[PDB]
Scaffold this motif. Structure first.
Motif, PDB file in Angstrom:
ATOM      1  N   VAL A   1       0.861  -1.211   0.000  1.00 12.83           N
ATOM      2  CA  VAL A   1       0.000   0.000   0.000  1.00 12.83           C
ATOM      3  C   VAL A   1       0.888   1.249   0.000  1.00 12.83           C
ATOM      4  CG1 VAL A   1      -0.182   0.567   2.455  1.00 12.83           C
ATOM      5  CG2 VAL A   1      -2.185   0.771   0.963  1.00 12.83           C
ATOM      6  N   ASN A   2       0.407   2.326   0.553  1.00 15.97           N
ATOM      7  CA  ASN A   2       1.215   3.577   0.592  1.00 15.97           C
ATOM      8  C   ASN A   2       1.517   3.924   2.054  1.00 15.97           C
ATOM      9  OD1 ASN A   2      -0.368   3.438  -1.926  1.00 15.97           O
ATOM     10  ND2 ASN A   2      -1.914   4.424  -0.741  1.00 15.97           N
ATOM     11  N   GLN A   3       2.528   3.319   2.622  1.00 18.56           N
ATOM     12  CA  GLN A   3       2.860   3.598   4.053  1.00 18.56           C
ATOM     13  C   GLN A   3       4.020   4.598   4.154  1.00 18.56           C
ATOM     14  OE1 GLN A   3       5.767  -0.035   5.347  1.00 18.56           O
ATOM     15  NE2 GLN A   3       4.257  -0.288   3.792  1.00 18.56           N
ATOM     16  N   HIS A   4       4.599   4.715   5.322  1.00 19.52           N
ATOM     17  CA  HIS A   4       5.732   5.667   5.516  1.00 19.52           C
ATOM     18  C   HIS A   4       7.032   5.036   5.012  1.00 19.52           C
ATOM     19  CE1 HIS A   4       4.506   9.178   8.036  1.00 19.52           C
ATOM     20  NE2 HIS A   4       3.326   8.582   7.770  1.00 19.52           N
ATOM     21  N   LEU A   5       7.768   5.748   4.205  1.00 25.48           N
ATOM     22  CA  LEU A   5       9.051   5.211   3.683  1.00 25.48           C
ATOM     23  C   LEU A   5      10.199   5.831   4.481  1.00 25.48           C
ATOM     24  CD1 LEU A   5       7.718   3.670   1.583  1.00 25.48           C
ATOM     25  CD2 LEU A   5       9.192   4.719  -0.133  1.00 25.48           C
ATOM     26  N   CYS A   6      10.927   5.050   5.231  1.00 31.63           N
ATOM     27  CA  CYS A   6      12.035   5.646   6.027  1.00 31.63           C
ATOM     28  C   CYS A   6      13.263   4.727   6.032  1.00 31.63           C
ATOM     29  CB  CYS A   6      11.563   5.862   7.465  1.00 31.63           C
ATOM     30  SG  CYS A   6      10.325   7.182   7.499  1.00 31.63           S
ATOM     31  N   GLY A   7      14.400   5.262   5.669  1.00 35.46           N
ATOM     32  CA  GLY A   7      15.671   4.470   5.661  1.00 35.46           C
ATOM     33  C   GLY A   7      15.414   2.998   5.323  1.00 35.46           C
ATOM     34  N   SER A   8      15.781   2.111   6.216  1.00 33.79           N
ATOM     35  CA  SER A   8      15.588   0.647   5.970  1.00 33.79           C
ATOM     36  C   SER A   8      14.282   0.405   5.216  1.00 33.79           C
ATOM     37  CB  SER A   8      15.544  -0.092   7.308  1.00 33.79           C
ATOM     38  OG  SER A   8      14.713   0.622   8.213  1.00 33.79           O
ATOM     39  N   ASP A   9      13.171   0.734   5.811  1.00 29.98           N
ATOM     40  CA  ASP A   9      11.874   0.524   5.116  1.00 29.98           C
ATOM     41  C   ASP A   9      11.992   1.064   3.699  1.00 29.98           C
ATOM     42  OD1 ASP A   9      11.699   0.365   7.817  1.00 29.98           O
ATOM     43  OD2 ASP A   9       9.601   0.851   7.853  1.00 29.98           O
ATOM     44  N   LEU A  10      12.603   2.199   3.560  1.00 33.49           N
ATOM     45  CA  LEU A  10      12.768   2.798   2.214  1.00 33.49           C
ATOM     46  C   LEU A  10      13.394   1.760   1.290  1.00 33.49           C
ATOM     47  CD1 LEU A  10      12.060   5.091   0.745  1.00 33.49           C
ATOM     48  CD2 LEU A  10      13.989   6.370   1.636  1.00 33.49           C
ATOM     49  N   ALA A  11      14.541   1.258   1.653  1.00 35.85           N
ATOM     50  CA  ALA A  11      15.198   0.232   0.806  1.00 35.85           C
ATOM     51  C   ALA A  11      14.358  -1.040   0.833  1.00 35.85           C
ATOM     52  CB  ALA A  11      16.589  -0.073   1.356  1.00 35.85           C
ATOM     53  N   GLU A  12      13.978  -1.493   2.000  1.00 28.80           N
ATOM     54  CA  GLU A  12      13.153  -2.729   2.082  1.00 28.80           C
ATOM     55  C   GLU A  12      11.904  -2.558   1.223  1.00 28.80           C
ATOM     56  OE1 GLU A  12      12.746  -4.360   5.867  1.00 28.80           O
ATOM     57  OE2 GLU A  12      10.907  -5.394   5.428  1.00 28.80           O
ATOM     58  N   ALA A  13      11.355  -1.375   1.187  1.00 30.36           N
ATOM     59  CA  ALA A  13      10.142  -1.154   0.354  1.00 30.36           C
ATOM     60  C   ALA A  13      10.529  -1.292  -1.114  1.00 30.36           C
ATOM     61  CB  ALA A  13       9.589   0.247   0.610  1.00 30.36           C
ATOM     62  N   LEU A  14      11.586  -0.646  -1.522  1.00 32.65           N
ATOM     63  CA  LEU A  14      12.017  -0.771  -2.939  1.00 32.65           C
ATOM     64  C   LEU A  14      12.583  -2.178  -3.136  1.00 32.65           C
ATOM     65  CD1 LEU A  14      13.692   2.662  -2.938  1.00 32.65           C
ATOM     66  CD2 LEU A  14      11.730   2.028  -4.342  1.00 32.65           C
ATOM     67  N   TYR A  15      13.132  -2.736  -2.089  1.00 32.81           N
ATOM     68  CA  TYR A  15      13.711  -4.109  -2.161  1.00 32.81           C
ATOM     69  C   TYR A  15      12.605  -5.102  -2.487  1.00 32.81           C
ATOM     70  CZ  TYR A  15      18.436  -5.580  -1.221  1.00 32.81           C
ATOM     71  OH  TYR A  15      19.763  -5.931  -1.356  1.00 32.81           O
ATOM     72  N   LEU A  16      11.393  -4.732  -2.211  1.00 34.36           N
ATOM     73  CA  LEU A  16      10.263  -5.643  -2.449  1.00 34.36           C
ATOM     74  C   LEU A  16       9.538  -5.255  -3.747  1.00 34.36           C
ATOM     75  CD1 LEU A  16       8.530  -7.759  -2.077  1.00 34.36           C
ATOM     76  CD2 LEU A  16       7.652  -6.767   0.024  1.00 34.36           C
ATOM     77  N   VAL A  17       9.828  -4.103  -4.287  1.00 39.71           N
ATOM     78  CA  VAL A  17       9.167  -3.702  -5.559  1.00 39.71           C
ATOM     79  C   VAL A  17      10.123  -4.001  -6.710  1.00 39.71           C
ATOM     80  CG1 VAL A  17       8.455  -1.807  -4.105  1.00 39.71           C
ATOM     81  CG2 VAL A  17      10.033  -1.368  -5.974  1.00 39.71           C
ATOM     82  N   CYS A  18      11.388  -3.795  -6.485  1.00 38.52           N
ATOM     83  CA  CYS A  18      12.386  -4.060  -7.546  1.00 38.52           C
ATOM     84  C   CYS A  18      13.193  -5.308  -7.179  1.00 38.52           C
ATOM     85  CB  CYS A  18      13.316  -2.854  -7.670  1.00 38.52           C
ATOM     86  SG  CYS A  18      12.731  -1.791  -9.011  1.00 38.52           S
ATOM     87  N   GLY A  19      13.472  -5.495  -5.918  1.00 32.63           N
ATOM     88  CA  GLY A  19      14.246  -6.696  -5.489  1.00 32.63           C
ATOM     89  C   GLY A  19      15.544  -6.792  -6.291  1.00 32.63           C
ATOM     90  N   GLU A  20      15.515  -7.477  -7.402  1.00 31.98           N
ATOM     91  CA  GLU A  20      16.752  -7.604  -8.229  1.00 31.98           C
ATOM     92  C   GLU A  20      16.707  -6.576  -9.360  1.00 31.98           C
ATOM     93  OE1 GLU A  20      14.517  -9.665 -10.736  1.00 31.98           O
ATOM     94  OE2 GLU A  20      13.677  -8.488  -9.140  1.00 31.98           O
TER      95      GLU A  20
END
Lengths: 21, 30
Positions: free
Chosen positions: B2-21
């Motif tokens: 969904v559209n939650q708060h993006l912060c540091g780790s979550d920021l990467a973890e969030a993109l890590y789950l949308v782009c991953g590789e």
């Protein structure tokens, strides 16, 4: 930036898709 | 994902789950 605009504010996958290849 | 708060780790973890590789860049802000 995103580190401050995405943390100080909320962002949807759309914005995310704008920061990756 | 969904559209939650993006912060540091979550920021990467969030993109890590949308782009991953797909390789996601999150350069620093000004």
């Amino acid at each position: 930036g995103i580190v401050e605009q995405c943390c100080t504010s909320i962002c949807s996958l759309y914005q995310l898709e704008n920061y990756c290849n | 994902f969904v559209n939650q708060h993006l912060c540091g780790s979550d920021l990467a973890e969030a993109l890590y789950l949308v782009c991953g590789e797909r390789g996601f860049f999150y350069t620093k802000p000004t």
